[PDB]
Amino acid sequence: TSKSEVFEFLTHLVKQEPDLLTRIYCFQPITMNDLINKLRNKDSFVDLIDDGTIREWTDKLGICIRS
């Protein structure tokens, strides 16, 4: 699975979660754990994606991660 395919998949999950979508285009910080829980709940495949790849995606998409 290419990184491009994974990034498209994660972006598509965000777009199906209205509350989370609004939070991201309003630049709201979110913890990695909270984000991954919201994503996984839209599609359990997120379990198979490593943290480093998720973090690369958050950087690219402008998602603000709070430690």
Partner: protein
Amino acid sequence: EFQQIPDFYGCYLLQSISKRQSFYIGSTPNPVRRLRQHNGSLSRTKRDGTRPWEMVAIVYGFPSRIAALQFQHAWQHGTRYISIHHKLAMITSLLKNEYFRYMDLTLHFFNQKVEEIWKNDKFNVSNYTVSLSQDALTEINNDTIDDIMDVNEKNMELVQNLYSTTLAEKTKTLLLYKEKIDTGINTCQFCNKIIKHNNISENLFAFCRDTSCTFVSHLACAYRYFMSEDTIIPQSPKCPKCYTLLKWCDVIYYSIKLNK
């Protein structure tokens, strides 16, 4: 509950006036108070001449304290996002990075000689804005105590002017948008329903940055319109009425603060 975008949050570069190879990078919501703390003390350290510091540049417009700290730490590390020449090149490298590009940050110089070195872009690192203080300092004279003090006092006045003016401008603009909402007769550019606080999607509004332009919409409606590799956050959308370039971060700043 949403958190507001800061009225001001900036990442600054200090250069010691006397020890001109000494620099400091930090971030703050109030650069005037912060510069006093650096130059005096944190609250009411033997001096070796490092103080006073000149604040030579500040990057501001961050959507959160978290984002400013991310920039600050990347800038200090020198980082997965990628002498005075290196410190300034790092600014450009970060402003080109995908993550910070969404923020349409402003790079402001308080010292024109520092601005010229940045512009010279020795390393050819070259949507963000660049500005230079009116009456910016130029070559620094640090030969005497009085010269050093004069630099510190003039630099403080420049930092005060930028900060107090930025806050006053946001205050004025908030008041003008609030008046538009308060009339209760504006309608959404896209869905045509009356603009009124009544449901986050219904109470977040978007305005043109030109306060005399009449473009107003629901934030959700503007978002939908602007968004029609895949992305989530609009980048440099244009006003559908006057076609001027908008900064999505400023749109959100006013949107959320008006609702709060």
